[PDB]
């Protein structure tokens, strides 16, 4: 029936004709090469260097499972041509995610801002929600750092993802998001760190 | 041969239906199993396949730049959706009774045969005159006042999504 063969390529498991008339091969390659990026993602986003890179890596798996959820759900056994047409409006989007990642890659703020410029570049198209849901969770830990100088004042650093690192007492070196609030955060914290010693 | 053709009309060429970079899809030569009179209707049928291939090749290539070109291709797949869906159906009808000939298959396309041709030169004017910027929202509109009802109902969809970009930017500025 061959449908359980083609449908089991989007998952990654090899098959009798998927290793690792006669024109079907051309049709097969159009759904085949879709699979080669799905596997090329789990090889790239499997780990749980940078903290913000982990969250973006943790946000990606929040999406692939949906792609694994949509498959193996609707079709028990459908027509061969139905598969190619059904997975077109969705398959091409999977190949777009290869242009985003590698399959080098920035980290820290350099990545949290690079992903932002990917929004305005392709805003109105159908790639707005998926990129947004990534950016909405790829900035989750970075807000916590920002949520320190505003509430508690205990600066938290791990590898340098923060744009700011650590008589005169004012040597916390400082030097996208609106600069109208950038420089203000730098002073909104040092005041708290100064009242803690008084 | 039926399922062979329904792939050739999808964008996959083979031995029976060779592909040429200049002319387009066409039958190679006479075949003994089939009749020598069908060698014509297929060539009349491929004049449609060549359109879809040259469509999807351009759609993927994205080529020139600008959002209004990105969105045009984004919408260009929507009008092209009933073509695919109506092609998946042909296989189902042939799966039921095995007495259907190419005549019925040629008959099923009907609407797509008189639509693609008029929506082919709209693409050609873009790639041949470097239509950059919002000027697309007129070049597509000047062809939206066409007489053919099917076309008048196709381009209007593309203009209906291409306006979504301006409506996005316009509200973002005002």
């Amino acid at each position: 029936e061959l449908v359980k063969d083609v449908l089991n390529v989007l998952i990654g498991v090899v098959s009798a004709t998927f290793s690792l008339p006669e024109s079907i091969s051309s049709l097969l390659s159009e759904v085949a090469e879709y699979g080669t990026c799905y596997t090329r993602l789990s090889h790239f986003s499997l780990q749980p260097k940078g903290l913000v890179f982990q969250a973006f890596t943790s946000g990606l798996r929040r999406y692939l499972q949906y792609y694994r959820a949509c498959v193996l759900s609707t079709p028990p056994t459908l027509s061969l041509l139905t598969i190619g047409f059904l997975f077109k409006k969705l398959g091409r989007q999977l190949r777009y995610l290869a242009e985003l990642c590698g399959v080098a890659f920035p980290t820290g703020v350099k990545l949290l801002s690079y992903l932002y410029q990917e929004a305005l570049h392709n805003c109105s198209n159908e790639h707005y929600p998926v990129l947004l849901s990534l950016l909405k969770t790829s900035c989750e830990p970075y807000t916590r750092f920002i949520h320190d100088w505003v509430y508690s004042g205990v600066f938290r650093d791990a590898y340098g993802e923060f744009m700011i690192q650590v008589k005169l007492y004012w040597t916390h070196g400082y030097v996208v998001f609106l600069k109208h609030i950038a420089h203000d955060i730098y002073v909104c914290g040092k005041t708290i760190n100064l009242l803690k010693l008084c | 041969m039926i399922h062979e053709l329904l792939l050739a009309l999808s964008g996959y060429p083979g031995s029976i239906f060779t592909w040429n970079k200049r002319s387009g899809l066409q039958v190679s030569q006479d075949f003994p199993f089939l009749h020598p009179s069908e060698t014509s209707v297929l060539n009349r049928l491929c004049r449609l396949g060549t359109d879809y291939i040259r469509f999807t090749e351009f759609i993927e290539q994205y080529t020139l730049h600008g959002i209004y070109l990105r969105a045009f291709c984004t919408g260009l797949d929507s009008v092209l959706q009933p073509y695919r869906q109506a092609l998946l159906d042909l296989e189902q009808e042939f799966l039921g009774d095995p007495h259907l000939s190419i005549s019925h298959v040629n008959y099923f396309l009907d609407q797509f045969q008189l639509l693609f041709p008029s929506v082919m030169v709209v693409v050609e004017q873009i790639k041949s005159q470097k239509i950059h910027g919002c000027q697309i929202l007129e070049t597509v509109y000047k062809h939206s006042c066409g007489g053919l009802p099917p076309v008048r109902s196709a381009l209007e969809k593309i203009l209906a999504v291409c306006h979504g970009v301006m409506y996005k930017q316009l509200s973002a500025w005002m």
Binding site: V150, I181, D184, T191 | -
Partner: peptide
């Protein structure tokens, strides 16, 4: 539209009170 209001709104309300 990219209007960053979910960040600055719970933020500017606290900056003026500290200063």
């Amino acid at each position: 539209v990219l209007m960053k209001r979910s960040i600055t709104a719970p933020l500017a309300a606290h900056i003026s009170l500290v200063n």
